[PDB]
Amino acid sequence: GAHMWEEFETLYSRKEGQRQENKNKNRYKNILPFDHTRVVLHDGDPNEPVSDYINANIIMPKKSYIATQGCLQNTVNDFWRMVFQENSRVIVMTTKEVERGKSKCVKYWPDEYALKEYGVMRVRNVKESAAHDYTLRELKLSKVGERTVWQYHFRTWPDHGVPSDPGGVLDFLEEVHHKQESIMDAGPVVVHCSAGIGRTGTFIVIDILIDIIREKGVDCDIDVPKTIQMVRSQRSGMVQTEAQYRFIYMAVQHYIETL
């Protein structure tokens, strides 16, 4: 069940992220990907001494995730290299571009009915669908030298705290779940927020727990702290605040109530 038995307060090398060549690829100087789960980018420009780095980790709980930060202007091209290489077909964006006057993510997609080239990658935005809690962008990604990538852009997360009820997040996650399952052998679902750890960890942990309930039923063994620790062994500090922690339990409880 989804009861909170333990309080929030009860809750590996990062050498590549620490290298001088990669300093400007990190949004926050001290939030870095673990070496053992980082996404290693291949096929980089041979003129660049270091072309294999993005601040992102694979999260393996079948479904896997890439937890990453919001793009910086100088990491947009690497973000698309990552999506292409990993065969990702769904992107979950959990922030506005700007929140309370601070940039959280550079716009890395073209406007509806436009195409842009980001380095070696070509992205066409063929249709946007604007729901109460999110916008869905149907993107087409190809190497300049094609696959559909569905970007689910959550709109309603408050600029302070967490949503006071999880209905919007649950509806969003359910659409993401069906979309991912509709695409044969799709790669990891990309999930991002500013730093790629707070909102990103909250969405990923909820989704992991809901997927357990899908396979094992409403009465299955749930252990939220254990699940958070497991994700934290793959990217530092996933789930940042006590409100996020309480929100996870509330979302799973509500999910269970739908069944």
From Swiss-Prot:
Instruction: Pinpoint the Tyrosine-protein phosphatase domain residues.
Output: 5-251
Identify the domain of life.
Eukaryota
User: Residues that bind substrate, according to the entry?
Assistant: 159, 193-199, 240
Effect upon mutating residue 57 to D: In NS1; common mutation
Q: Which residues form a coiled coil?
A: none
Q: Where in the cell is it found?
A: Cytoplasm; Nucleus
Task: Indicate the residues that form the catalytic site.
Answer: 193
Q: What is the effect of changing residue 202 to M?
A: In LPRD1; does not affect subcellular location; decreases protein tyrosine phosphatase activity against CDC73
Q: Where is it expressed, tissue-wise?
A: Widely expressed, with highest levels in heart, brain, and skeletal muscle.
Q: What is the effect of changing residue 240 to P?
A: In LPRD1; does not affect subcellular location; decreases protein tyrosine phosphatase activity against CDC73
Q: What is the effect of changing residue 193 to S?
A: Abolishes phosphatase activity. Enhances interaction with NEDD9
Entry PTM: Phosphorylated upon activation of the receptor-type kinase FLT3. Phosphorylated upon activation of the receptor-type kinase PDGFRA. Phosphorylated by activated PDGFRB.
What quaternary arrangement does the UniProt entry report? Interacts with phosphorylated LIME1 and BCAR3. Interacts with SHB and INPP5D/SHIP1. Interacts with MILR1 (tyrosine-phosphorylated). Interacts with FLT1 (tyrosine-phosphorylated), FLT3 (tyrosine-phosphorylated), FLT4 (tyrosine-phosphorylated), KIT and GRB2. Interacts with PDGFRA (tyrosine phosphorylated). Interacts (via SH2 domain) with TEK/TIE2 (tyrosine phosphorylated). Interacts with PTPNS1 and CD84. Interacts with phosphorylated SIT1 and MPZL1. Interacts with FCRL4, FCRL6 and ANKHD1. Interacts with KIR2DL1; the interaction is enhanced by ARRB2. Interacts with GAB2.
* Role: Acts downstream of various receptor and cytoplasmic protein tyrosine kinases to participate in the signal transduction from the cell surface to the nucleus. Positively regulates MAPK signal transduction pathway. Dephosphorylates GAB1, ARHGAP35 and EGFR. Dephosphorylates ROCK2 at 'Tyr-722' resulting in stimulation of its RhoA binding activity. Dephosphorylates CDC73. Dephosphorylates SOX9 on tyrosine residues, leading to inactivate SOX9 and promote ossification. Dephosphorylates tyrosine-phosphorylated NEDD9/CAS-L.
Query: What's written under domain?
Result: The SH2 domains repress phosphatase activity. Binding of these domains to phosphotyrosine-containing proteins relieves this auto-inhibition, possibly by inducing a conformational change in the enzyme.
What disease is this protein tied to? Answer: LEOPARD syndrome 1: A disorder characterized by lentigines, electrocardiographic conduction abnormalities, ocular hypertelorism, pulmonic stenosis, abnormalities of genitalia, retardation of growth, and sensorineural deafness.
| Assigned protein family | Belongs to the protein-tyrosine phosphatase family. Non-receptor class 2 subfamily.
Which named protein is this?
A: Tyrosine-protein phosphatase non-receptor type 11
Which residues of the complete protein appear here?
248 to 525 of 593
